[PDB]
Enzyme design. Structure first.
Site, mmCIF file in Angstrom:
data_model
loop_
_atom_site.group_PDB
_atom_site.id
_atom_site.type_symbol
_atom_site.label_atom_id
_atom_site.label_comp_id
_atom_site.label_asym_id
_atom_site.label_seq_id
_atom_site.Cartn_x
_atom_site.Cartn_y
_atom_site.Cartn_z
ATOM 1 N N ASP A 1 19.201 -1.258 -1.466
ATOM 2 C CA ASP A 1 17.843 -1.693 -1.643
ATOM 3 C C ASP A 1 16.971 -0.693 -2.202
ATOM 4 O OD1 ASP A 1 15.713 -3.029 -0.562
ATOM 5 O OD2 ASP A 1 15.400 -1.609 0.560
ATOM 6 N N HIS B 1 13.741 -4.855 -2.419
ATOM 7 C CA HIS B 1 13.154 -6.065 -1.530
ATOM 8 C C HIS B 1 11.687 -6.264 -1.752
ATOM 9 C CE1 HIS B 1 11.752 -3.051 1.359
ATOM 10 N NE2 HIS B 1 10.587 -3.795 1.376
ATOM 11 N N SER C 1 8.984 -1.451 5.886
ATOM 12 C CA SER C 1 9.579 -0.416 5.176
ATOM 13 C C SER C 1 8.778 0.028 3.844
ATOM 14 C CB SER C 1 11.185 -0.810 5.202
#
Lengths: 346, 396, 396, 396
Positions: free
Chosen positions: D98, D68, D165
């Protein structure tokens, strides 16, 4: 309540608390809707012919927790009135189209929603310069007309916009370019007949691909009828609009045809039942929507007046819109609502 | 090698269970269409809840959990950490503490946690919470004892951002020190840190549910709030520094003995009462039948009286192993039934609004623990020796 | 048995106090009615604040705390951890660092924390925070040193979800390593993690308040922002990579020496200035009377000048033990009074807008520490030897 | 003295890098004016992203990070913890997990973390996360293993309130145990706790990107959802307990082999399929060319078929060191190019919609790893031996 009247100045301080609850399958409108309104109307005698005035009205929601405040100014204007000539005022006020459409905005809770606030010259909005002539120089009892101008309310300042900004700018659904409008009404005995026209430039922020209903100007044409006597109130209004009626959050309707009708009766013992029908039919909407109902409902309700300061009401919105893709996309409510209200006012 | 909480967690997990509740409730009938730009203002609706619980009696299959999970349950399922599934039934609950007791139906080879002594807790002490945050399963999080109230709600930073108030709070020895709760009622979810009922209180409230059917907490039966409320102003209250009486509960001791909305209690047994809060908490340190004289304020009114079991903690369709809202009455003076419903399955059986049950279908039923102790041993013939004051009938 | 932070917390808690502030402020007059579907756009209003503080000098009763708690205080109360209550008075504050000093009035048997050396901090180091999160009391939470800035704000995960920026940050030895702050000004509350001023900076800023009356931080007196602001666009600024001067402060050195809104500073003593930020921070590493030559941009303008004490950190009704906004002037050149108010209790005493006070009611008042040192020893007869430039009057 | 994580953090930090991405994307053209009381409903736009990464191969300069962060990158910069700056290029990415791989251009003296064995993780185990929460830099936070999935996403309370994150999840020995991710796609930011891909899966997915150009994950090429969707109702689906087929992807195996929107898969190789979820995850445990027979439902339809590489994980302007969306085709049967664009820099070079490339500008290109292995060794003369089925042309 008139709290001051001395040496030619009068001040009326007024307001209400509406203890109000909605019942609906739609949880976004369901629950406590309690609110209050406060206002003042002042007038000062300048000469025997000339009076100055000002009015301010404010709504404060009573249904939130104490870590927030949801409140706004409904109207705020100052004006001059000259006996048998006319009046002028400027500020946040009602658009002249409302001179006609207000006649059906008489329901206990709902109604008056084929248009909205900050919606060109259709209802409340900023920067109205309003000229009014009552009774035609006092030579035709009951005949009134008005002409109104609205200045541009554009993009917000300090947000990186490179065009279309005003000091008091806002989101595109609540913007307007310069506008002009007019109204004529005639009331004889119980009867009333009226018409209004508005024409507003639309801003560049409003005419982007992000909104349906692109157009150079927003126009509205309204006719209305009223009967108000012998404890009977009847009224109806029909409005045709062009790039002026909002379609929820999607933008505006290329063309819309709006109709509202109300019937009310006042019993001697204080009960006032009400029946109404409203619909807004949009045409040539774009994005494959084609022709769609924007609004459609029957409203049945009643108010009980204990006196001029205390009343209670129930209003039942029987919503004839069906849940479809269009109403989902626009975020238009399709569920019924029951409102129960208890109102103290002064 | 490296330190780890995994070694004690392995001795703890077999005692933590998952709980799936299925039940219904009364919701209002949706009015259509729905207008999201119109701020407005009966049918049963099924809902699903899920939470954690702790095995507290391996033999009886007694699991402690939050009342906000099992409340209104019709069906309560339990799944052990090894994956075995069981059914459970309500045995007790107490909304104040947000603590409830259940019993696994047909337990086989269970493990119970050891309960530690809450009273020996200190702030820098290490803490570990175990719960089911977002449904996705059993999560453990660690931390320390943040605040020791001193009711002694335990405060700890072993919580979870935006998650539902889990369950077990355990010390570094794997012993139960508190059951985590939700102080955001009829919501679940935290304020930012964690609140637990201390293990010693859990033990205490829990035994009551077992040996009586409910917890012995007497209510003064008034209902009201602070002196800021719209009604304290809309009614203009003189001398504001106490508990505002908005209403005196029906068939209550406050009602019976004497009291009426408006009076603001100023003291309880000589001591100052500056807030409903203070009062609600003080009346909670007094078991049924107790006598507490308090000073009211109207012009200068004061009385003395004795309270009865509260109405918040009650029973329903779990007294008679069958299916169908009673509670205890005073001391061991039978089991008094309360507000009957509309479906009337139990009213249909000759049970009114105030019907006691001293007859254990033949024997003594001084309480719901006993009563239920019989409607579980002999499920054959049942004749409820009920006597609602005068009428002493015997229905089936 | 098991490890615990309780043993050192018991040696630390006596130094942490609670603080209750009562004070007022100017709010706008509410316009009625209130319309919640109408997005619009003087009277004192009392408010209450509460926070934590740390006893830093047991003898003098000196407590360090956040400026966002005591700011605008009229009454500041302190409660020790043993429950003894005291009154406190402002001795100093500094909005930049969000750090303030207070003094317990009439201390008796106090305990002060030992301050550790901030400079020896490292990221994996263990941390423990102590504060009053939601008012409900004194909560301790633990964790580690997350980021060591490198101004050296300390970053730590020992914070609190949705709570107000507490106070003390202590290491595993119970020594003070930082005071937790709120970088969400005029709010209090965190961004997600914790920010503390390091103990060494706390010691330093704190001594200044004691020995001078305020902290020696010179301001360039300009006010402005970045090159993105609506005014940098609405005025179209050429070559954008510096600090935008929105206005030059009155009676300032920037004003006096020469400068006018618009110019974008590009450097400070030869070094590049790419943002107001960079600049605001650089001017904060320079005590009063310093000289710093910077390059401006209009077509190509540049100057050199000397700054004076900032106006953010000032005093009010705590200089004269009595009651009534001065600050220091240059080096030990007396105490210059600033913007007088409307109630005019102090202006009423013959004190204008620029009145210095070198006369200690008889002696030398090179600063507010000294001045206040006299208005506390001899509260009998007071004649302020003030001289606002020329006029050398002696008011009472 | 006192325990600290600083000693192992010093052996770990040199492996953690910061990442600054610059890139563009297609945004819709703003329609003006803007009306904030009007809820409505192509141009490239530059954006900036920033995240963390972990050096996983010191020699090759291989850094693992979240997809991401680097997704849509045009320029990806890396800054070591000592402050040295480098440039990086995409080598691989996989939106499902991801997880993405990059390569520092021109590495010099790098340090790589040691990867630990994910399979040996246990819940009470200690955990430490390292990331760049709010941009302000490299923050480390600590905690424990909360949930071990059992795909084995690791759950840990070492997260950050409201932050993005981060990246590395390390054990107390400084070994990599998982890369922290964002399950709040096309957002970044957490649900309340942390989710990491386990180190063993990271190793596995990462090697594939290296030795093939992309990860070998076959797709069934259907797209759809649950049986609750408006389309499952608006089309009234009989027997609801499976995956709803909203559409069969073009040129797919589901398409080729046979299937049409509406059918609700009920099983996969005999086993029950109760949700798209179950299915999306099951098809993810099968590498390209595999054969999986599943049961559909229309009246009672069922088929068997073989899937090809998914389209989510693909390459772009990093195959030819130059600049310009291919992916692998079946086994080592060359590199098949997919959907060409509008700017057409690569289509302009004689490359259509389905053009394979078995000729390594002269040699064998069974895959993108190899192909790219040549467009990096001999950047002089380039003749792409492409053959889109029939036409076997040789463009430059």
């Amino acid at each position: 309540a008139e709290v001051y009247n001395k040496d030619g100045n009068k001040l009326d301080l007024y307001g209400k608390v509406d203890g109000l609850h909605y019942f609906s399958d739609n949880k976004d409108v369901d629950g406590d809707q309690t609110y209050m309104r406060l206002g003042f109307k002042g007038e000062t005698q300048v000469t025997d012919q000339l009076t100055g005035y000002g009015q301010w009205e404010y709504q404060i929601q009573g249904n939130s927790a104490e870590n927030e405040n949801n409140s706004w100014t409904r109207v705020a204007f100052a004006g001059l009135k000259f006996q048998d000539v006319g009046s002028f005022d400027y500020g946040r006020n009602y658009g002249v189209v409302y001179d006609v459409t207000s006649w059906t905005d008489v329901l206990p809770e709902f109604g008056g929603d084929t248009y909205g606030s900050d919606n060109f010259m259709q209802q409340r909005g900023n920067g109205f310069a309003t000229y009014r002539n009552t009774d035609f120089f006092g030579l035709v009892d009951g005949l009134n007309f008005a002409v109104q101008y609205q200045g541009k309310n554009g993009n917000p300042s300090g947000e990186g916009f490179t065009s279309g900004v005003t000091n008091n700018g806002r989101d595109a659904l609540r913007q307007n370019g310069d506008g002009v409008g007019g109204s004529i009404t005639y009331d004889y005995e119980g009867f009333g007949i009226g018409g209004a026209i508005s024409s507003s430039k639309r801003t560049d922020a409003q005419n982007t691909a992000a909104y349906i209903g692109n157009g150079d100007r927003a126009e509205t044409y309204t006719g209305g009828l009223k009967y108000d006597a012998n404890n009977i109130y009847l009224a109806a209004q029909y409005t045709q609009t062009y790039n002026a009626t909002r379609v929820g959050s999607l933008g505006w309707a290329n063309k819309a045809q709006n109709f509202e009708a109300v019937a009310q009766y006042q019993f001697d013992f204080g009960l006032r039942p009400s029946l109404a029908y409203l619909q807004s039919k949009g045409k040539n909407l774009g994005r494959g929507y084609d022709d769609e109902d924007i609004l459609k409902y029957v409203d049945v309700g009643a108010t009980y007046y204990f006196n001029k300061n205390m009343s209670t009401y129930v209003d039942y919105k029987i919503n004839l819109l069906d849940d479809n893709q269009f109403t989902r996309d626009a975020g238009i409510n399709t569920d019924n609502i029951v409102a129960l209200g208890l109102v103290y006012q002064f | 090698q490296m330190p780890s909480l995994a070694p004690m967690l392995e001795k703890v997990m077999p005692s933590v269970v998952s709980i799936n509740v299925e039940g219904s409730t009364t919701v209002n009938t949706p009015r259509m269409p729905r207008n999201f730009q119109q701020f407005f203002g009966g049918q049963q609706q099924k809902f699903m809840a899920l939470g954690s619980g702790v095995i507290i009696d391996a033999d009886k299959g007694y699991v402690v959990t939050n009342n906000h999970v099992v409340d209104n349950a019709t069906v309560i399922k339990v799944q052990l950490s090894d994956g075995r599934k069981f059914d459970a039934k309500m045995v007790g609950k107490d909304p104040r503490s947000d603590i409830a007791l259940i019993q696994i139906q047909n337990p086989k080879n269970l493990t119970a946690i050891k309960m530690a002594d809450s009273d020996a807790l200190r702030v820098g002490d290490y803490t570990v919470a175990i719960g089911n945050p977002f449904g996705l399963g059993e999560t453990v999080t660690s931390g320390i004892v943040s605040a020791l109230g001193r009711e002694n709600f335990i405060q700890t930073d072993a919580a979870i951002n935006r998650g539902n108030s889990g369950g077990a709070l355990v010390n570094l020895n794997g012993e139960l020190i508190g059951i985590n709760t939700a102080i955001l009622a009829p919501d679940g979810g935290n304020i930012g840190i964690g609140f637990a009922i201390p293990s010693n209180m859990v033990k205490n409230l829990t035994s009551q549910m077992v040996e009586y059917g409910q917890v012995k907490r007497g209510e003064l039966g008034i209902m009201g709030t602070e002196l800021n409320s719209e009604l304290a102003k809309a009614m203009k209250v003189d001398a504001q520094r106490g508990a505002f009486v908005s209403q005196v509960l029906p068939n209550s001791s406050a009602a019976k003995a004497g009291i009426k909305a408006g009076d603001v209690i100023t003291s309880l047994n000589g001591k100052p009462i500056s807030s409903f809060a203070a009062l609600r908490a003080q009346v909670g340190t007094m078991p049924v039948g107790s006598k507490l004289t308090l000073g009211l304020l109207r012009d200068g009114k004061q009385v003395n009286v004795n309270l009865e079991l509260q109405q918040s903690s009650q029973n329903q369709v779990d007294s008679s192993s069958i299916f169908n809202e009673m509670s205890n009455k005073g001391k061991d003076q039978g089991v008094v039934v309360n507000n009957v419903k509309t479906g009337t399955p139990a009213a249909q059986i000759g049970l009114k609004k105030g019907d006691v049950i001293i007859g254990a279908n033949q024997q003594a039923v001084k309480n719901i623990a006993e009563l239920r102790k019989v409607l579980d041993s002999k499920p054959s013939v049942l004749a409820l020796n009920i006597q609602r004051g005068d009428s002493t009938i015997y229905l089936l």
